[PDB]
Every structure is written in C-alpha cells, then in structure tokens.
Design a protein around this ligand. Structure first.
Ligand SMILES: *[C@@H]1O[C@H](CO)[C@@H](O)[C@H](O)[C@H]1NC(C)=O
Ligand SMILES: *[C@@H]1O[C@H](CO)[C@@H](O)[C@H](O)[C@H]1NC(C)=O
Ligand SMILES: *[C@@H]1O[C@H](CO)[C@@H](O)[C@H](O)[C@H]1NC(C)=O
Ligand SMILES: *[C@@H]1O[C@H](CO)[C@@H](O)[C@H](O)[C@H]1NC(C)=O
Lengths: 54, 54
C-alpha cells in the first residue's frame, strides 16, 4: 500500500498484506507437507491519495 | 485455555493467565525479599468449545 508525503518522499504502509496459501483453514501459517517444493513471490502495488482506499 | 481446530489439532490460547503471588498490591512483578526461597509451578487446564468461556 504505497502513498505519498508532503515533500513527495514515497512511503509504504506497515499496513501492507502478505498472503500465504490456504492450509488447515488458517492462512497465518503455511507448512510444506510434500517431498519437493518451489516457492515464488509475486506482488501487487496499489496506491492511494486518501488513506487506506487503494 | 486449551480449545480445538477443525482438524482437531489441539491449540493453546496466547490468551492464557500466569499468576504470581501478591506483593506491593501489583501482581505483575513478584520479588523475593527473604534469605531463602522455594519456587513451585502448578497448573490448571480448562477447555472450551466456544471461545473464551472455559
Ligand atoms: C489489507 O487488507 C486490509 C483488511 O485486513 C485492508 O483494510 C487494507 O487496506 C489492505 N492493505 C493493503 C491492501 O495494503
Ligand atoms: C503539517 O501538519 C500540519 C497539521 O496537520 C498542517 O497544518 C501542515 O500544513 C502540514 N505541513 C506539511 C504537510 O508540510
Ligand atoms: C484469563 O483471565 C481473563 C481476564 O483477564 C479472562 O478473560 C480469560 O478468559 C482468562 N484466560 C484463561 C483462564 O485462559
Ligand atoms: C474455514 O473457514 C470458513 C469461513 O469461516 C468456513 O466457512 C469453513 O467451513 C471453514 N472450514 C474449516 C473449518 O475447515
């Protein structure tokens, strides 16, 4: 969740969201339960003028 | 404060309570003010189906 400052210094929001795949319903802890695995990271950048709209 | 998950994996609640003896009214910090001491730990296990009833 990127935004902006008076000067214009771009600032990210500690209020950002990390999503792990779904396991045992909770999605706050994902575990690997297989013999092999591959991990990939992807991201989406959203912005706002107003706080928390994105 | 133990409970249960959909699968059944028993889970304890960070919402658990540790009680120290009473000193200077506050019970969040207990100090030893004697020449000798003995410390014992005891516990009670309570459970719930509904959250926070125990
Ligand atoms: C993340 O999701 C929360 C709801 O938990 C939402 O309020 C917030 O705007 C989102 N933050 C992002 C997408 O940066
Ligand atoms: C700094 O904050 C004050 C109070 O919100 C505001 O009046 C002023 O315009 C701000 N100046 C900036 C954004 O540089
Ligand atoms: C601990 O006491 C709190 C009140 O501070 C209560 O709401 C909570 O259910 C108790 N947790 C236990 C006994 O695990
Ligand atoms: C996972 O959570 C959703 C939303 O609360 C619920 O509909 C679903 O039945 C749950 N599945 C479980 C408990 O495995």
């Amino acid at each position: 969740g990127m935004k902006r400052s008076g000067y214009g210094q771009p600032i990210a929001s500690p209020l950002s969201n990390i999503t792990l795949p779904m396991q045992d319903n909770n999605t706050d802890v994902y575990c690997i339960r297989s013999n092999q695995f591959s991990i990939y990271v992807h991201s989406t950048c959203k912005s706002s003028l107003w706080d928390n709209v994105f």
